[PDB]
Amino acid sequence: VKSMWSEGATFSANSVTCTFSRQFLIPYDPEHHYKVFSPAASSSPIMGYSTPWRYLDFNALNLFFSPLEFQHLIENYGSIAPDALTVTISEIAVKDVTDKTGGGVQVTDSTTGRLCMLVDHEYKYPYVLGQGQDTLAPELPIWVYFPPQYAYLTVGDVNTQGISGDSKKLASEESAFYVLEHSSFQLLGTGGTATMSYKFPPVPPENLEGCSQHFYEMYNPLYGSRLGVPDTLGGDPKFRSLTHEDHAIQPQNFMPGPLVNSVSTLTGLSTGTSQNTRISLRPGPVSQPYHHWDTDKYVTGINAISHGQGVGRFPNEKEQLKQLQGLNMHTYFPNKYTDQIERPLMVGSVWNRRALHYESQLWSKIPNLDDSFKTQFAALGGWGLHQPPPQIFLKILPQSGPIGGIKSMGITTLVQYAVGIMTVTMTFKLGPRKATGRWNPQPGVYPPHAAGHLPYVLYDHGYEKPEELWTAKSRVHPL
Amino acid sequence: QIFLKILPQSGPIGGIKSMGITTLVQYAVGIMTVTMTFKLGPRKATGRWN
Amino acid sequence: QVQLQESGPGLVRPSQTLSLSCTVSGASISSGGYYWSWIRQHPGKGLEWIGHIYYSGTVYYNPSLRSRVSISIDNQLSLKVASVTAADTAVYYCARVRVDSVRGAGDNGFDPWGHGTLVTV
Amino acid sequence: AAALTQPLSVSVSPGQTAIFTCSGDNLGDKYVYWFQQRPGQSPALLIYQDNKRPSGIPERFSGSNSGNTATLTISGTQSTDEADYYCQTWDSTVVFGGGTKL
Amino acid sequence: AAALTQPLSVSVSPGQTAIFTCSGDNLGDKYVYWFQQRPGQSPALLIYQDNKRPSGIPERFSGSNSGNTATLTISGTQSTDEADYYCQTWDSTVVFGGGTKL
Numbered sequence: 001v002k003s004m005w006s007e008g009a010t011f012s013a014n015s016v017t018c019t020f021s022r023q024f025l026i027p028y029d030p031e032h033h034y035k036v037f038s039p040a041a042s043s044s045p046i047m048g049y050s051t052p053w054r055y056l057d058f059n060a061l062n063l064f065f066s067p068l069e070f071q072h073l074i075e076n077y078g079s080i081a082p083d084a085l086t087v088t089i090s091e092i093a094v095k096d097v098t099d100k101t102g103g104g105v106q107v108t109d110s111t112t113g114r115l116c117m118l119v120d121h122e123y124k125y126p127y128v129l130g131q132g133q134d135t136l137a138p139e140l141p142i143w144v145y146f147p148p149q150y151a152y153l154t155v156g157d158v159n160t161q162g163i164s165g166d167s168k169k170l171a172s173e174e175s176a177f178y179v180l181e182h183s184s185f186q187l188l189g190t191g192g193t194a195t196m197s198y199k200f201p202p203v204p205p206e207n208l209e210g211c212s213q214h215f216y217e218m219y220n221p222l223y224g225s226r227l228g229v230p231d232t233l234g235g236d237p238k239f240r241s242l243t244h245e246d247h248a249i250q251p252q253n254f255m256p257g258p259l260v261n262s263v264s265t266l267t268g269l270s271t272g273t274s275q276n277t278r279i280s281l282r283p284g285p286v287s288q289p290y291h292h293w294d295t296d297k298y299v300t301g302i303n304a305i306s307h308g309q310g311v312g313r314f315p316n317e318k319e320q321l322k323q324l325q326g327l328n329m330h331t332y333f334p335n336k337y338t339d340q341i342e343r344p345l346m347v348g349s350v351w352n353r354r355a356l357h358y359e360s361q362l363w364s365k366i367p368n369l370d371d372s373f374k375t376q377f378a379a380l381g382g383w384g385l386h387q388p389p390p391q392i393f394l395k396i397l398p399q400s401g402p403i404g405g406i407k408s409m410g411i412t413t414l415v416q417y418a419v420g421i422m423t424v425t426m427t428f429k430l431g432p433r434k435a436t437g438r439w440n441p442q443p444g445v446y447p448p449h450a451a452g453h454l455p456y457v458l459y460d461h462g463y464e465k466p467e468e469l470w471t472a473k474s475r476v477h478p479l
Numbered sequence: 480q481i482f483l484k485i486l487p488q489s490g491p492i493g494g495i496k497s498m499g500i501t502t503l504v505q506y507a508v509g510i511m512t513v514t515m516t517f518k519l520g521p522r523k524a525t526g527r528w529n
Numbered sequence: 530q531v532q533l534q535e536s537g538p539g540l541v542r543p544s545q546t547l548s549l550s551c552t553v554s555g556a557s558i559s560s561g562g563y564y565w566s567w568i569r570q571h572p573g574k575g576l577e578w579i580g581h582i583y584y585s586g587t588v589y590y591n592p593s594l595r596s597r598v599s600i601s602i603d604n605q606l607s608l609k610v611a612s613v614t615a616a617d618t619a620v621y622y623c624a625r626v627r628v629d630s631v632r633g634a635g636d637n638g639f640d641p642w643g644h645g646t647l648v649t650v
Numbered sequence: 651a652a653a654l655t656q657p658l659s660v661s662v663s664p665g666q667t668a669i670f671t672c673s674g675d676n677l678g679d680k681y682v683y684w685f686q687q688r689p690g691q692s693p694a695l696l697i698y699q700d701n702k703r704p705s706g707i708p709e710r711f712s713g714s715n716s717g718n719t720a721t722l723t724i725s726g727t728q729s730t731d732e733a734d735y736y737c738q739t740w741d742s743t744v745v746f747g748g749g750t751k752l
Numbered sequence: 753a754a755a756l757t758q759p760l761s762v763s764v765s766p767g768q769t770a771i772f773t774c775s776g777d778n779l780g781d782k783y784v785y786w787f788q789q790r791p792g793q794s795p796a797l798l799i800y801q802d803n804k805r806p807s808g809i810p811e812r813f814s815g816s817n818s819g820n821t822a823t824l825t826i827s828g829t830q831s832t833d834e835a836d837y838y839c840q841t842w843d844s845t846v847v848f849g850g851g852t853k854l
Contacts, residue, residue, distance in 0.1 A: 027492035030679045038742075042601065043586035050633075097491050097498075104716050105499040107490055134630070144489045149631070164599040164609060166588070411676075417491045493679045495634045500778075566744075575656075576685075576693070576736050576746045589743055622692055635740030638683035640704065642692040665763070709757065725759060 003091060006423050007141060009069045013432070015083065016073070018064035019425035021090075022137055022145040024394075026054050026115060026418040032398050034179070040168045043276055046153055047169035053118075053150040053180055053393040057129055057136050058087070058424050059382070062359045067447065067456045067470075070358050074472055075445040079205035079431025082362065085389055087196040089117060090421035094190055094396060097415045110190070115418045116395040117186045117194050125178050126152040129391055130364030132305075132380045140463060145422070150393060152178070180393055187397075198389045204376055205431055206356050212436075212476035215323045215350060216252055227251055256324040257287045257351020259343040261303065264327045268303050283379045287351040289317035289325060299327045305380065307359060307469060315357045315469040316448070323352060356381050358447070358470040363388045434477050442475050531555035533623045537646035544613050551606035551623040551643060558604060559584045562628035566639060567600060567608050571619040579608070581626065618650035651675040652741040656748035662727055670750040672720045672737035682720040683738045684713060686731075693736065697722060727752075753777040754843040758850035764829055772852040774822045774839035784822040785840045786815060788833075795838065799824060829854075 009018035035050040065073060073080070094113040100106040128151070135148035157172035186194050219225075221244065228239035229249050242249070261269040262284070272278040283305045284290060290304035291314035298314075306312040320326065331343045360381025365388045366372055378384030396418050402409045436442075447455040447470040455466045485507050491498045536550040551565070558565060562583075569577035582588035582600040590598065599609040606623060623643035629636035655673035662668040672682060682700050685693035686707075696707055700715035713722045724731060737747035757775035764770040774784060784802050787795035788809075798809055802817035815824045826833060839849035 023487070023489065025489060025492060028494040028679070030494065030676050035742075038589065039587050040590065041587045042582075042599070045587070093488070095490065099717070101717070105491065107499065107503055142487075144487065146492070149633070162599065163596070163611065164601065166599070415491070415493075417493075419488055419490055495631060495636075495681070496679060570687075575734075575749045576738075578744045578746055581744075591743065634681055635683075635744075636681065636699070638695050638698045638738065639685070639693075640695045640698075642694070645692050710759075 005090075005421065006425070009065060011069075011072065011076070011430075015427045015429045017425060017427045018069070019423060020058075020063050020141065021421055021423040022141065022143075024056065024145045024147050024420050024422050026147065026394050026396050026420075028396075028415065028417055030413060032413070034177070040162075040166055042162070042164065042166045044158055045167050045169040047156040047171070047175065048151055048153045049177065051150040051152070051178075051180055051393075053395050054147040055129065055150050055391045055393050056087075056145070056147040056422060057133075058422075059130055059361050059363065060136050060359055061356070061362060061381075062139055063137050063424075064426055064428075065358070067358070070470070071445050071447075073430075074208055074474060076433065077430045078209045078433035078475070079207050079429075081203050081205040081429045081431075082200045082383075082426055083429045084200060084425075084427040085196070085198040086425050087198075087392060088423045088425075089188070089194045089392075089394075090423055092188060092190055092192055092418060092420045094416060094418035097417070099415070110416060113399055113416045113418070114187045114189045114397050115192075115420075116397060117188045118180060118183050118393040119186075119194075119196055120390045120393065123387065123390065124183075125180065125391070125393075126154075127365050127388065127391065128152055130361060130378070130382065130384070130388065132361065139465075147394065150180075150391075180395075196390065196392060200389075201385055201387065203383050203385060205429075206472070207353075207431075208356075208472040209434055209475045209477050210319045210473040211322060211479040212438075213479035215254070215256075215479065216250075217247075218479070219250060225250060253348070255346035255349045256343065257349045258285070258345050259288060259325060259329055259331075259341070260285065261342065262288050262325070262327050262329060263302050263341060264299050265302060286354050286377050286379050287325075289320040289327065289354060291315060292317050292321040292326060294321075301327050308465070311467075313465070313467065313469055315355060315471045317355055317471070319352065319355055319473045323350070325351065353377060354379070355471045355473045357472060359465075433475070436476065436478050438476070438478065445474050531625070531641045533625070533641060533643035535621065535623060535643050535646040537621075537648055540618075540649035541613075542616075542650055544611075547608075547610045547613060547648065549608040549621055549646065549648075551608075552604075553606070553625075558602065558606070564626040564628060565600075565602070565606050566622075566624040566626060567598075567606075568622040568624050568639070569617070569619045570622065571617075577619070579610070581624075582606075583628070613650055616650045618648050621646050621648060651677065651680075651739075652745060654737055654739060654745050654747040656737060656750055658748075659751035662752065664727060664729065666727070667723055667725060668727055668752060669721050669723050670735060672722070672747055673718060674720070674739065675718060677720055677739065678715060678717045680715070680739050680741075682713070682715050684711075684722050685736045685738060686733050687736065688730075688733045696735070753779065753782075753841075754847060756839055756841060756847050756849040758839060758852055760850075761853035764854065766829060766831065768829070769825055769827060770829055770854060771823050771825050772837060774824070774849055775820060776822070776841065777820060779822055779841065780817060780819045782817070782841050782843075784815070784817050786813075786824050787838045787840060788835050789838065790832075790835045798837070 005021050006019050007021050009016050029052045032052045037048045039045045092115055094110055094115050095107055096110040098106045098108055137145055154175045156169040156175045158167055158169050160167050188194055224244050225242040228241055230237050231240050232238045267278050267280045268282050270278045270280045282303060284303040290301035292299060293316060304314060331340050362382045364378040364382055364384040366375045366384055366386050375384060396416055398413055400412050447466050448468045449455050449466050485505055487502055489501050532554045534552055538548060564581040564583060566581035567579040569579060578591055579594055579598050580588060580590040580600050582602055584602060588600045597610055597612050601607045622645050624639035625641045626639055627637035651674045657671060660668050660670060684697040686696040687693040695704060697703055697711055697713040700713055703711055710725045720737060722735060732752050734749045734751050736749045739745045753776045762770050762772060786799040788798040789795040797806060799805055799813055799815040802815055805813055812827045822839060824837060834854050836851045836853050838851045841847045
């Protein structure tokens with residue numbers, strides 16, 4: 001039997017199978033406690049639990065696709081949707097440090113230590129995987145993954161104990177203490193292997209193709225319009241007909257989508273109580289851009305997220321500025337004009353999406369509370385689904401010697417750490433590209449850069465990512 | 480070309496610390512046995528006498 | 530450069546609210562991740578830590594001085610230690626720590642300190 | 651740990667070293683920070699993360715953290731290092747040490 | 753490494769040794785070269801490749817390179833070895849050390 005490190009995407013006219021492999025490292029915990037919290041806010045505080053476990057977060061898109069493979073994805077296909085996912089934990093080498101006392105560290109190898117692996121197929125434990133935090137994976141396959149520690153927030157009971165105003169969320173009857181050691185635990189010793197084998201639900205595709213037409217300009221530019229438009233107001237209408245030059249008063253049969261607090265340049269847009277509780281709903285809905293290119297510069301929005309760096313790394317949503325969205329887009333009403341910045345849902349509407357890019361998420365989670373709309377596509381990129389890919393928790397073990405009969409001899413957790421290899425494969429159901437009788441060469445697919453500093457390549461940790469994000473809508477539909 | 484890296488086994492950590500050398504130190508010895516066959520032709524004829 | 534200047538009221542013995550303040554110069558305090566500590570030092574003895582506060586209201590306290598002191602932020606970094614029947618006057622420093630990444634162990638230490646005020650009790 | 655141990659004072663001459671002890675339970679898997687407090691002045695961050703020094707601190711200060719102790723070694727002590735040195739860790743709140751009076 | 757560490761000066765008597773320190777990150781898997789610069793003169797290649805000496809350098813100079821440090825040991829220092837000794841490596845360009853003034 002052959003032991004392999006697998007990596008690489010294989011394309012077809014149908015789905016592409018993209019696998020990657022990293023080296024993980026379950027470090028250590030000198031205390032295997034649970035370590036509740038002590039936040040004690042003073043102005044609704046938080047209340048958590050710090051589990052001694054390690055989950056892994058392969059959420060982003062820049063791990064399954066190389067930049068050459070992402071460029072081959074954009075210039076050849078016109079949709080993408082995942083349908084399968086397997087996570088194999090390869091060769092495990094749990095080892096122990098012997099503390100040379102004069103050298104400090106000497107690492108032998110342990111055959112009796114193990115690595116407790118739990119897969120949460122039943123969704124019993126809280127899901128913290130898809131929120132966009134700075135522990136995902138290395139972008140390049142040569143660096144070592146350090147998987148994050150598992151922790152979660154619960155709901156408790158806010159008290160007010162202190163001197164001035166000190167609040168503290170204590171435990172209530174609704175609060176929960178999920179001990180992960182009440183489960184089934186593939187114990188997974190040295191050399192052991194384990195798999196997950198998830199299967200994605202039917203999700204709508206992401207349509208990696210722009211438009212060569214405005215949605216409000218879909219008419220014959222000649223010929224006028226069969227209908228009329230008012231001239232006088234005040235009870236005596238006196239409607240007139242239209243010519244072909246009436247472009248700003250052409251009647252549309254479909255409205256644009258909502259623009260709830262789209263502005264340009266804290267908390268952004270925010271719900272909450274009077275002025276100071278005020279939790280943020282930062283990257284808007286998915287129907288809104290937060291960065292595009294107007295006639296002179298880049299407009300950058302209040303509701304933007306930076307994706308790195310600062311100056312920021314924002315995706316250029318040029319396909320939302322086209323179809324009647326954008327940042328400083330007011331709506332006007334002739335009520336006895338009222339400039340409004342919020343646009344409502346407007347029963348017949350189309351708002352296409354905020355575009356996915358090379359570094360976006362893949363799923364988040366739709367929360368278990370009911371009556372969702374629309375929630376098929378989450379913000380921060382990705383899909384977002386009921387029953388997401390389950391979390392793979394990885395503790396090592398507390399091997400706890402020696403004793404000597406009465407004594408607390410030694411360290412009693414001796415010291416152990418585990419290295420390994422995680423090979424994650426995911427298949428994406430690709431759709432065929434939309435037809436164009438176009439005759440023009442379509443624009444080329446290359447990541448954006450400015451001058452001299454090229455995109456993904458080593459320079460004199462070396463490897464540098466571009467200033468703008470590499471979006472995915474660069475071929476035209478033609479609507 | 481037959482490329483041969485070893486691996487970057489990268490311990491220990493201790494939970495937060497950058498303990499040790501983190502590439503610990505490793506080296507690999509081995510044996511490469513390379514066989515090659517050469518299609519030989521027969522020697523050209525000479526009625527030479529020398 | 531970032532400097533921290535204190536404010537001392539003087540001396541009040543018969544159990545009044547000891548109020549302090551620490552205006553930060555060089556950089557604003559609601560500009561990112563930095564704790565803002567209050568640290569004591571008894572003359573002839575080691576340092577003592579009261580508590581630190583983030584700009585979004587969350588404040589950690591010392592478990593020994595928990596029900597006496599109160600840290601607050603109105604771009605002022607106040608401290609309202611009451612019940613001064615125990616005559617602790619020592620010294621009151623301000624200090625800033627960069628907020629760590631993993632929340633487990635402290636990745637940074639108190640690099641910018643204050644000048645220190647001498648309260649008497 | 652939650653209670654750092656540190657002796658009272660040390661005695662040194664110019665031309666040698668003075669190594670202090672900051673004892674503590676499981677201090678090897680922790681960060682220890684050293685603070686230089688000259689008399690009449692606020693402390694300054696001397697050695698952070700058990701080995702590193704900032705730009706304002708000269709290159710004669712170095713420390714270590716192994717096992718249940720963390721030392722601070724001064725290489726070539728001058729006539730201006732007579733200052734209280736405190737070790738400080740983070741046992742989930744903050745833990746300050748006693749101080750070796752030099 | 754890219755920044756070699758070396759102390760200021762050392763004090764010695766005739767009849768003993770004077771060992772210096774050239775600290776550096778991962779200096780064990782590197783080459784360290786020592787240079788003897790008498791005052792008023794150019795430096796000379798004292799010890800090359802951590803153990804070797806050329807023909808012009810006498811057989812009382814020897815060095816080492818282990819772990820994160822590289823030492824230079826003078827066996828029986830005479831009254832002519834009062835010279836600045838610099839350690840030099842190659843972190844892909846050239847890295848010179850500070851210099852132990854003897």
